[PDB]
Design a protein around this nucleic acid. Structure first.
Ligand SMILES: Nc1nc2c(ncn2[C@H]2C[C@H](O)[C@@H](COP(=O)(O)NP(=O)(O)OP(=O)(O)O)O2)c(=O)[nH]1
Ligand SMILES: Nc1nc2c(ncn2[C@H]2C[C@H](O)[C@@H](COP(=O)(O)NP(=O)(O)OP(=O)(O)O)O2)c(=O)[nH]1
Ligand SMILES: [Ca+2]
Ligand code: NA
Length: 901
DNA sequence: TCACGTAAGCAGTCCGCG
DNA sequence: GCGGACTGCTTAC
């Protein structure tokens, strides 16, 4: 097989590399690496090296990396550019692996672990590590085994061995119900004291040293805790055995609020799953506890138990160990579903970077571009420093707040990347500038044509049409790779709806799920075979189709994130190819494109509908336009449609055969106006929305920019069994909105969209009289808690104290002195409740850590003093008032005339 | 919340002007 | 009592 690296590090004058060799074996090598950098030379100093602008360079090969670094300093002091890849790690990888890396994951050691530290005095700070680590579960992906290290004797109590037999028994038999699929993969190791356990773990670590090290919160808790514990017991030098090259570094990670401290183990790639999840999941969660995320992703969660965790090992060592095993397992199940480790490996190997650099799109693109130019012997420019500066972004149309009955949407394919390719935008393709007319003049085609020679953007930039730019070239590759995965996602999605349709009245036979690939549309052979299946098999296939879809989703959307991030990187001062001219050339073109086609779409539909000056385009945002289809439906007549599927078919054909060709002529003309290099504004039908035929639903509404709801029957090529609510921006979509209120407002919107005013009024009346009986966590708001200390004065709110911070201070006063009350953590999230006047907490709200029950100390008080009236007014009634006033509905029967003033 | 971007909405506090 | 300026937080694209 071809070799590929596992990890790379620079330690002084050498590169340390762990890799997989031609035979498939893991090896390690230290290289006295000799890097090269470049300097501009006279046009006569020949050679084959040129900068991206075509100016010649001479190569300078250094004895070692210290020399090359010192040379960079002296050039800065002279005032000349030092060109070439200054991150020597990346130049090494690029030299050693001068080919496309096909990596084999089964040879990569992915370690997944979690620890437990019993602590009587509150949260065990890993800086101090002053409590014995009493359990470790370490999953190895090569061996496919969970290694469990279990401390029998501790100053906090001595316990019996964990029973694998009881662990396997059901909950209803007194057991822990550790899953059947992993019960045989557990290797259990009790130890009579903590020193023996840690010393065995360290040796185990040497035999099976992780390449990728993951888990939940491992970077901020588990790793710094194991490191410091071992350091406190055995010394700094034994602790460094956690690194294959015996070098560590205490990294201080700073943000806009404070500083935290992680441990860098050289020669290991740490991918904390909570970081992978925050970056790649596209969710904003009210809590990031493993149990909460696990329940959201898997519908199950962490093992349950009685009393505080601090007392679990004494009272139930059995459940305590089982719980630790399951926690590790839950992370593995989340990864089987979302596939972020796999994603990380693909991007890392494609870009040729350290795997943990996938958190940095700028690092990723710098390496792809560098590898790309090196193939043609071209030399990358030096990083330069730049003041941060704002620049303009996308266009968003002010919609007239209203109900909108029938709507069709259209959207452009990967807008910013497509613009980069169409216009040919790149650091090396800039050809000059032209004198700019105001933007509306380009939108209306009345301004002078910018160029007959260069490709233009309406911000005044001109680009060469004839030469290739590394940005368009490299963005095209990643965009093309995305296509396949996106196609898998949509196929699974279309197959989802086939399963769902057969679920309405399923056969009741005794059968099994069909063996198919969900990545490709279902053949007619199996569509027929699906109609015979039972509810058990069908729901099972629904699970597999949905899993295939999520995996497809993760693959496609994160490649889109990566290509979108190139457009943004051109606007970030740390990018090597930072240039506000380029970044603005993309966004300005984008805002001309959308408004251009709004004009063309209005022109076309006025012609076809026989009208003058109607606004058919009711809204647009960045890459999308929404078209009112009322008059189109009125041309045929609602009484002439048989059912909902009929008018949806009608609008579908009309968009496909009438509008898209007109829109395509629209964009071709724009392409010629700007004299671009390649036409790539490809805008097609997205959503078809409206009320069900014969109902009183209003179909859809807008309240303002980025705030709207639609009852959708079709999205791209997916036709839906039952209509789907597409809600954007409204409180139902916001993590800060209380769970039960999201559910209630969603059901209010569905009744508005699909059933009408009267149905909305029945539901509202009912929710109003019943909601006081909802669980307090489900009606609590959520907020991130930043700058708690900034507004903290004597443990009381200082000036301008935001409401949710006031809540945290009230909490702190209530749990003061109680060392075992859960503390609010700066930066994390809090539930927030309003309190009635005269309450014992001394303020108008209380907050506590999200994803948790409020401590039993103060729970009964909070429940007695929660302010339902204020809560109902702020989180339910006020937003509902916005929807219904926009949609021109009433959530309460009005006695007379719908008056005002 | 650890070197992709801008646009823009809502909650809540405080102040200047009635 | 109301509107604007502002911080803080959240989403859309
Ligand atoms: N092209 C290029 N190379 C770079 C850059 N930064 C660092 N390097 C490094 C990468 C390379 O290590 C080195 C020169 O790249 P080769 O021409 O591909 N190697 P050669 O043909 O000289 O091999 P032999 O010894 O057989 O003649 O400069 C850069 O910006 N561009
Ligand atoms: N810099 C940057 N620009 C972005 C980002 N997201 C959008 N834009 C700008 C640049 C993009 O080209 C443009 C369109 O966004 P789509 O890529 O189509 N993400 P959507 O979820 O809306 O599409 P789909 O229908 O696939 O879910 O908005 C981002 O994360 N970063
Ligand atoms: Ca889009
Ligand atoms: Na929007």
């Amino acid at each position: 097989m071809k070799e590929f690296y596992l990890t790379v590090e620079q330690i002084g004058d050498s590169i340390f590399e762990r890799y997989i060799d031609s035979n498939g074996r893991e090896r390690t090598r230290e290289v006295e690496y000799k890097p090269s950098l470049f300097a501009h030379c006279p046009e006569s100093q020949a050679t084959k090296y040129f900068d991206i602008y075509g100016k010649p360079c001479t190569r300078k090969l250094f004895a070692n990396m210290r020399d090359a670094s010192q040379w960079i300093k002296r050039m800065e002091d002279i005032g000349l550019e030092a060109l070439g890849m200054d991150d020597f790690k990346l130049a090494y990888l690029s030299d050693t692996y001068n080919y496309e890396i096909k990596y084999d994951h089964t040879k990569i050691r992915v370690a997944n672990f979690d620890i437990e530290v019993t602590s009587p005095d509150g949260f065990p700070e890993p800086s101090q590590a002053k409590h014995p680590i009493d359990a470790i579960t370490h999953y190895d992906s090569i061996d496919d085994r969970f290694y469990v290290f279990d401390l029998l004797n501790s100053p906090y109590g001595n316990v019996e061995e964990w029973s694998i037999e009881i662990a396997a028994k059901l909950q209803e038999q007194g057991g822990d119900e550790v899953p059947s699929e992993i019960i045989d993969k557990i290797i259990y190791m009790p130890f009579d004291n903590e020193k023996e356990l840690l010393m065995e773990y360290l040796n185990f670590w040497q035999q099976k040293t992780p390449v990728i090290l993951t888990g939940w919160n491992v970077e901020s808790f588990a790793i710094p805790y194991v490191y410091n514990r071992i350091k406190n017991i055995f010394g700094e030098s034994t602790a460094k055995r956690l690194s294959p090259h015996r070098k560590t570094r205490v990294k201080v990670i700073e943000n806009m609020y404070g500083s935290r401290e992680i441990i860098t183990l050289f020669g290991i790639s740490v991918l904390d799953y909570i970081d992978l999840y925050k970056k790649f999941s596209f969710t904003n969660q009210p809590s990031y506890s493993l149990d909460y995320i696990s329940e959201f992703e898997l519908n199950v969660g962490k093992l349950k138990y009685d009393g505080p965790i601090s007392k679990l090992r004494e009272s139930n060592h059995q459940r305590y160990i089982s719980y630790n095993i399951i926690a590790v397992y839950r992370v593995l199940q989340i990864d089987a579903k979302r596939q972020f480790i796999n994603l990380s490996l693909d991007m890392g190997y494609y870009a040729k970077i350290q795997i943990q650099s996938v958190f940095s799109p700028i690092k990723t693109w710098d390496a792809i571009i560098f590898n790309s130019l090196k193939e043609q012997n071209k030399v990358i420019p030096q990083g330069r420093s730049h003041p941060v500066q704002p620049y303009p972004g996308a266009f968003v149309k002010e919609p007239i707040p209203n109900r909108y009955k029938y709507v069709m949407s259209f959207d452009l394919t990967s807008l910013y990347p497509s613009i980069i390719r169409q216009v040919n935008i790149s650091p090396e393709t800039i050809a000059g500038t032209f004198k700019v007319a105001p933007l509306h003049d380009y939108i209306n085609a009345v301004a002078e044509r910018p160029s007959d020679v260069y490709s233009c953007s309406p911000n005044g930039m001109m680009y060469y049409k004839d030469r290739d730019g590394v940005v368009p070239t490299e963005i095209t590759k990643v965009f093309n790779q995305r296509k396949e995965h996106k196609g898998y996602m949509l196929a699974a999605q279309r197959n989802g709806e086939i399963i769902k349709e057969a679920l309405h009245n399923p056969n009741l036979s005794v059968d099994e799920p069909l063996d198919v690939d969900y990545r490709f549309d279902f053949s007619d052979e199996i569509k027929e075979k699906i109609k015979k299946l039972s509810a058990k098999s069908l729901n099972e296939m629904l699970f597999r189709a949905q899993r295939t879809e999520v995996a497809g989703m993760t693959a496609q959307i994160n490649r889109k994130l990566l290509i979108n991030s190139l457009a943004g990187a051109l606007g970030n001062v740390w990018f090597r190819y930072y240039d506000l001219r380029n970044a603005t050339a993309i966004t300005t073109f984008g805002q001309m494109a959308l408004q251009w086609i709004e004009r063309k779409v209005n022109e076309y539909l006025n012609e076809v509908c026989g009208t003058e000056g109607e606004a058919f385009v009711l809204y647009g945002d960045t890459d999308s336009i929404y078209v009112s289809a009322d008059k189109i439906i009125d041309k045929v007549g609602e009484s002439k449609f048989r059912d909902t599927n009929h008018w949806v078919d009608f609008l579908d054909k009309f968009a496909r055969e009438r509008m898209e060709p007109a829109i395509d002529r629209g964009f071709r003309e724009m392409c010629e106006y700007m004299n671009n290099k390649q036409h790539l504004m490809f805008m097609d039908r997205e959503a078809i929305a409206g009320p069900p035929l014969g109902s009183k639903g209003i179909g859809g509404f807008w309240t303002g920019k980025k705030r709207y709801a639609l009852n959708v029957w079709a999205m791209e090529g997916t036709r839906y069994a039952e209509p789907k609510l597409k809600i954007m921006g409204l409180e139902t979509q916001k993590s800060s909105t209380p769970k039960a209120v999201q559910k209630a407002l969603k059901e209010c919107i569905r009744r508005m969209l699909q059933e009408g005013e009267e149905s909305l009024q029945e539901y509202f009346k009912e929710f109003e009289k019943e909601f006081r009986q909802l669980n307090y966590i489900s009606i609590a708001s959520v907020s991130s808690a930043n700058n708690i200390a900034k507004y903290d004065v004597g443990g009381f709110p200082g000036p301008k104290c935001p409401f949710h911070i006031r809540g945290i201070l009230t909490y702190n006063r209530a749990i003061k002195g109680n060392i075992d009350a859960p503390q609010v953590v700066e930066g994390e999230k809090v539930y927030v409740l309003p309190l009635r006047e005269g309450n014992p907490f001394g303020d108008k709200c209380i907050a506590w850590p999200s994803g948790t029950e409020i401590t039993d100390l103060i729970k009964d008080d909070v429940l007695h003093w929660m302010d339902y009236t204020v809560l109902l007014e702020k989180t339910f009634i006020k937003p509902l008032e916005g929807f219904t006033s926009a949609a021109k509905l009433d959530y309460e029967k009005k006695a007379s005339l719908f008056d005002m003033f």
